[PDB]
Design a binder for this molecule. Sequence first.
Ligand SMILES: *C(=N)CNC(=O)[C@H](CS(=O)(=O)N1CCN(c2ccccn2)CC1)NC(=O)Cc1cc(C)no1
Ligand SMILES: *C(=N)CNC(=O)[C@H](CS(=O)(=O)N1CCN(c2ccccn2)CC1)NC(=O)Cc1cc(C)no1
Lengths: 220, 220
Amino acid sequence: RILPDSVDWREKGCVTEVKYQGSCGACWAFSAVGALEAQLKLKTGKLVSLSAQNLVDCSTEKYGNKGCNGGFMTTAFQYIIDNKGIDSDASYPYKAMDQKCQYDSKYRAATCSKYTELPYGREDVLKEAVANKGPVSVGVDARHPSFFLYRSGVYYEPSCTQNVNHGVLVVGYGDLNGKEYWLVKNSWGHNFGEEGYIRMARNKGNHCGIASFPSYPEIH
Amino acid sequence: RILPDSVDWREKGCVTEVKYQGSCGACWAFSAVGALEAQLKLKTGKLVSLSAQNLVDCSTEKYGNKGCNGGFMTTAFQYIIDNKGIDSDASYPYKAMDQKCQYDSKYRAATCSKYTELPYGREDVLKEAVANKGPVSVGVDARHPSFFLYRSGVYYEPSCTQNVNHGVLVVGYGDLNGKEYWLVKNSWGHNFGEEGYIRMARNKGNHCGIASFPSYPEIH
Ligand SMILES: *C(=N)CNC(=O)[C@H](CS(=O)(=O)N1CCN(c2ccccn2)CC1)NC(=O)Cc1cc(C)no1
Ligand SMILES: *C(=N)CNC(=O)[C@H](CS(=O)(=O)N1CCN(c2ccccn2)CC1)NC(=O)Cc1cc(C)no1
């Protein structure tokens, strides 16, 4: 298909409220559950926050993840596949700490059948996936002081690099006042940015590495 | 198909001489070129060493790579795709140091059309790719003295983890009197291990993370 000029998955009810990770480096877990939440809405018609804490506590060493000390969205997806489920956030709440794995199938709210990693740096392929599949988990370079101070508009930081450090969720794309953007859901609470979102420059040379390592899950 | 019990791509004429990276952390570049060397043989009938130095010098910041301070096989493949080529090793020989990008299309020896990332941690899927596609680029946990000290046989390190740090090339698989292994080409020269190779434990719980992050390229 010709792709739409703009997408916002919040308009189809596929995006949960913004979460607050606190001082725990669980962005990877928030990114992964956010991508799966959309697929769960598309499959079942029902929007349910999924347990980032379940990923922190249970998608650990075997998956190359370190809980509050960082991890991968892809290996989080593979945990959910291998585990045959993930609990709801309501059942397995977020504590911003490394804990023992408390997964229980009686609280399962989603499954995952597979995941797809997109080709490195390809903003056109990322656009196609956001339009045709759903929100996409990505990493960005969030190290620069400007990122923390973002309030509005389209974020463009000349000091940005493709050395990504922060897992976030692309929930859309568009153009604002002549600037193309990616709509990014962060996990630093509503105080960050525009109610927890940042519009990041799109088609500006893989700005901040946004299209470096994109992935999305699917449900059978 | 039912997969063969053992495979060795050296018998198929798809593996070049073992290289010596020296003090430059270019293992990712050697892994990537070795994977592509096999596909180039399968396509063209020619066995040619490809330029690891081209990747060190040219698949840099924009690809998330740091030359002699490490990088990704996947993003190296994407550089080859984006660049529409990689030079021969003969034309662009290995220096064991970071240099300005000297790529010249007049010395192009290969192209790449795509690469594939295998699902996390699946040794069965890795076996299928090695049997049916070609040598597979992987990362392993080489953070143990036993790896440096390896001489012969099937390598098993009880303290191994899935926190991989060394890029290598799976060029086959088999068993040593029933002890299953992956046949791995390293880039530590011909004095390392079994004349440049290490046989690493297979079907032992993703030992040393060998099946954590596998990828292979293809040519049009
Ligand atoms: C959040 N509070 C802390 N950040 C992380 O945990 C971070 C997430 S990420 O999205 O930046 N990211 C995962 C994708 N990843 C990658 C790199 C190369 C190939 C494939 N995938 C980049 C990092 N995770 C980490 O920083 C852990 C890590 C770093 C790297 C370089 N690999 O994994
Ligand atoms: C070689 N002499 C030095 N080591 C590296 O260059 C190393 C190679 S790796 O095999 O450990 N590896 C590349 C594969 N990579 C990955 C993760 C996810 C998807 C695809 N590929 C993991 C690392 N590279 C690094 O150490 C650089 C790096 C990247 C990441 C995320 N962590 O480390």
